[PDB]
Amino acid sequence: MKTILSNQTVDIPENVDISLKGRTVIVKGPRGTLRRDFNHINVELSLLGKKKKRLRVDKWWGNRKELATVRTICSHVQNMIKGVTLGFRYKMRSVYAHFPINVVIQENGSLVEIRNFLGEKYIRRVRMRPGVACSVSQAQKDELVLEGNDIELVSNSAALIQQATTVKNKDIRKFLDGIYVSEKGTVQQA
RNA sequence: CCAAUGGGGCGAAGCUACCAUCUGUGGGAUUAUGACUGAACGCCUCUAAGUCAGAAUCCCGCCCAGGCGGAACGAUAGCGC
Ligand SMILES: [Mg+2]
Ligand SMILES: [Mg+2]
Ligand SMILES: [Mg+2]
Ligand SMILES: [Mg+2]
Ligand SMILES: [Mg+2]
Ligand SMILES: [Mg+2]
């Protein structure tokens, strides 16, 4: 079955300016700008109102798979609003039974060195995605804080570190060592 | 000198032996898999749209040949313009 119309709307905070170049969404906020291209989805984007702006997503004559893309766009656009206003802050804890995991931040938070992971002599060097900054946590021991405006870049950056410290040829239910994503917050709490 | 290389010792050059010696190499997309964001299904979800890492595999490189396939350049005798 094709549905005549399926739509959803997004509310834009006053401090965020959204402009459309076709299906390219440009969100400008206090923390910067994010541009995402949605040309791989056949939807219709509309900006409504002037005082309280809104973004509308329309899908005319959509089957089940095409209808599922309508909310996906809204959620991405909301994350972009969240990124440019509050930012994204993933925290990671390093877990170890015997060998402390030493983390050194280089290149202004764009490179992470991991040493002595399960006692390995090999040094792991993880490169953060552009626009993502890693830093050791002054508040807690054995913790990292990744910050950025793009949720996917920040969360991909953290996945790289988490998968860098993988245990091999052991029972990973026993050998639990590794750095893991422990919290998903925002840079500015508001 | 002859004995169809008379026999035997040592033996140049050449050839030749893991029986001596030397040299044997880099990327790309990715598989399995593990994940990101994320609906579908207000939650969840590696998947649906989008995204990441990924290998004796695969393709290429390096290497071997070099097409009824080209190229630049030289010189061109009764011959070119
Ligand atoms: Mg064992
Ligand atoms: Mg005789
Ligand atoms: Mg001899
Ligand atoms: Mg590769
Ligand atoms: Mg996959
Ligand atoms: Mg890849």
Curated annotation (Swiss-Prot):
A GO cellular component annotation in the UniProt record: cytosolic large ribosomal subunit
Keyword tags: Acetylation, Cytoplasm, Ribonucleoprotein, Ribosomal protein
Known partners and oligomeric status: Component of the large ribosomal subunit.
Residues with PTM N6-acetyllysine: K121
Gene that this sequence comes from: RPL9
Listed name of the protein: Large ribosomal subunit protein uL6
Matching PROSITE patterns: RIBOSOMAL_L6_2 (PS00700)
Chain's role: Component of the large ribosomal subunit. The ribosome is a large ribonucleoprotein complex responsible for the synthesis of proteins in the cell.
Compartments reported by the entry: Cytoplasm
GO-annotated biological processes: cytoplasmic translation
Molecular function terms, GO-annotated: rRNA binding; structural constituent of ribosome
Family per record: Belongs to the universal ribosomal protein uL6 family.
One Pfam family of this chain: Ribosomal_L6
